[PDB]
Amino acid sequence: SFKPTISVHATPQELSAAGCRKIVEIIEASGSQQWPLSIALAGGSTPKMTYARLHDEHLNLLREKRALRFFMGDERMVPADSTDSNYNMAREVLLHDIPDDLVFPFDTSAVTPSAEATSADAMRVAEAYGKQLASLLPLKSVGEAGPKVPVFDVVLLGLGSDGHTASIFPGSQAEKETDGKVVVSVGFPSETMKPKVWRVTLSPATIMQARNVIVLATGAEKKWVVDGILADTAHKAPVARFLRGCEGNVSFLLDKEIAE
Numbered sequence: 001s002f003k004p005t006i007s008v009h010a011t012p013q014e015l016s017a018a019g020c021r022k023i024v025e026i027i028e029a030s031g032s033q034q035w036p037l038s039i040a041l042a043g044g045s046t047p048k049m050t051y052a053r054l055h056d057e058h059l060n061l062l063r064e065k066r067a068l069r070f071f072m073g074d075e076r077m078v079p080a081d082s083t084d085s086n087y088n089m090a091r092e093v094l095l096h097d098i099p100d101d102l103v104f105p106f107d108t109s110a111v112t113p114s115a116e117a118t119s120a121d122a123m124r125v126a127e128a129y130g131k132q133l134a135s136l137l138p139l140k141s142v143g144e145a146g147p148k149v150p151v152f153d154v155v156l157l158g159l160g161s162d163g164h165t166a167s168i169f170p171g172s173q174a175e176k177e178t179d180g181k182v183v184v185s186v187g188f189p190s191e192t193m194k195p196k197v198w199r200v201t202l203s204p205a206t207i208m209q210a211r212n213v214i215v216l217a218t219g220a221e222k223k224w225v226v227d228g229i230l231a232d233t234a235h236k237a238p239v240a241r242f243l244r245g246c247e248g249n250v251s252f253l254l255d256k257e258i259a260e
């Protein structure tokens with residue numbers, strides 16, 4: 001069944017250090033002929049620290065060597081310069097130094113501070129990203145028969161205490177997009193999650209076709225989520241349990257609380 005790699009880390013300087021160490025390892029293991037490897041970034045304080053480390057420690061590998069082509073795994077429907085934007089975060093800490101031809105944010109250019117985006121906006125952005133992904137990445141049939149979804153080399157993920165990952169929220173339609181017909185779906189956060197803005201996100205079908213999936217999570221409050229993904233039998237499962245079906249490698253980089 002589900003056999004993922006799990007590693008526990010005492011601190012943030014440590015989990016983030018392992019997160020960046022895990023990315024460089026895949027890069028190096030793949031070798032230069034395979035580069036640039038596609039990586040779908042996550043937002044959040046933990047991935048941000050991993051990005052700050054790639055910047056500080058491995059810019060030559062990313063810039064001069066062009067090891068990664070950067071995509072966003074999920075995004076908030078706000079302007080790119082917004083503090084609530086995942087790309088804005090990744091840009092500030094790492095992406096400002098990466099060649100423009102290796103950086104692909106979602107196109108939120110239609111979102112202004114004058115009007116909250118709706119799902120109709122999110123959907124237009126999702127469909128456009130999905131199109132770009134299909135021209136840039138290799139496409140794999142879902143189940144030797146199913147529709148074609150892009151194959152990322154790496155997808156970095158976070159977890160919410162509501163059981164969600166990326167911007168795939170509970171009860172959502174995106175959560176039900178597992179057959180490969182939809183590559184980038186949309187979603188609105190759950191009661192306990194913020195910011196309260198429409199999201200675009202890689203669908204579960206897309207994520208399950210990724211060659212490697214790296215999940216970084218901390219906090220006691222998210223322990224039920226990890227337990228729920230790893231449990232032999234689904235009971236009151238978190239959304240993130242869909243990760244069990246990943247076709248690639250899966251790794252969980254956890255702090256002490258969340259592990260136990």
Ligand SMILES: [Zn+2]
Nearest residue numbers: 055093096097
């Ligand atoms: Zn810099």
